[PDB]
Amino acid sequence: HTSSMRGVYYPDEIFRSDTLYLTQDLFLPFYSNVTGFHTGNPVIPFKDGIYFAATEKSNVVRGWVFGSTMNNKSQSVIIINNSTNVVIRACNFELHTMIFDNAFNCTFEYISDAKHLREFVFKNKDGFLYVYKGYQPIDVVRDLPSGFNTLKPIFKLPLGINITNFRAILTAFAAAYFVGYLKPTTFMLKYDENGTITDAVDCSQNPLAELKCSVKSFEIDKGIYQTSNFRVVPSGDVVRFPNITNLCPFGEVFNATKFPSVYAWERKKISNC
Amino acid sequence: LVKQLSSNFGAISSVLNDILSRLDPPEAEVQIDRLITGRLQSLQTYVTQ
């Protein structure tokens, strides 16, 4: 129910030697709050970052339908794997059965044919769908086990689609989601030999992590080290106007002793008040 | 250092919140960059001293 140091993927395709690189585009901070529907039920969560790490043995969940509002309003991406064949369709609508609903406007047809834990992270940035994959042999059935599980990118098909929801899970089944949202934060990756990270630090949870990210070191010695500067965000707002800033002649037509007749009504001009 | 703080470095003015609401944001970015460069030079001189 908590992403304890889980969801660390390669932000780019750059190979780095033994060093300590500082990543800014990395997401999924450590010790987050995931929403696992340990029941499988079709739900429509939010988007702009997810962490699907279903730990169900004998994986039945093999398809996700990304896109937008259904009922033929926008395009939808339907990634489905049937008999070791990853059919990545992104043109079907909703008016194994949702694919043959309607085929009014289809484009970009791409079929790639050829316990258990399969982790996936989807990212949409500037019209680019980044898909990662990771495997880790686990045995517990309670929740997300501990570990790192370095993710591996598999597909980078943009499709130019602004995905906003995902639903339509498989049926005829235990099946959970364990999906967790992400926020833009900074990370410090330990690029070791052979292109293996194996260790990361999220500089947003504890001052110790921020200090480790500041000096670019995983082992901190004893002593005081200045890290950053704090600022107090203003809460309220106070705007005061020059007392009355002028008025307008009104006390003369309502507090007078004499008034003309109806046919001889006076027209007084009032301006710049 | 205080006098160089409240001093212009080749811009419209030396006081913030004035060059913002008098031109376009792209036009004011140049003045902001000039002021930041001047402040950085003054602070570097102060640090060297």
Binding site: D221, I224, T227, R231, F241 | V2, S6
Partner: protein
């Protein structure tokens, strides 16, 4: 009575009478500074201050 606002020695606005009413002093600077981390060693413990 004629003075509307007032500045400090650093050429920064110190106080100003309320344009509305109840003529009194005004803004004082807020809290700021450099936050530091005290670590007794990673091999020793993992708590900071």
């Amino acid at each position: 009575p004629f003075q509307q606002f007032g500045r400090d020695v650093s050429d920064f606005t110190d106080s100003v009478r309320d344009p509305k009413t109840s003529e009194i002093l005004d803004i004082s600077p807020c809290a700021f500074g450099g936050v530091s981390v005290i670590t007794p060693g990673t091999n020793a413990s993992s708590e900071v201050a």
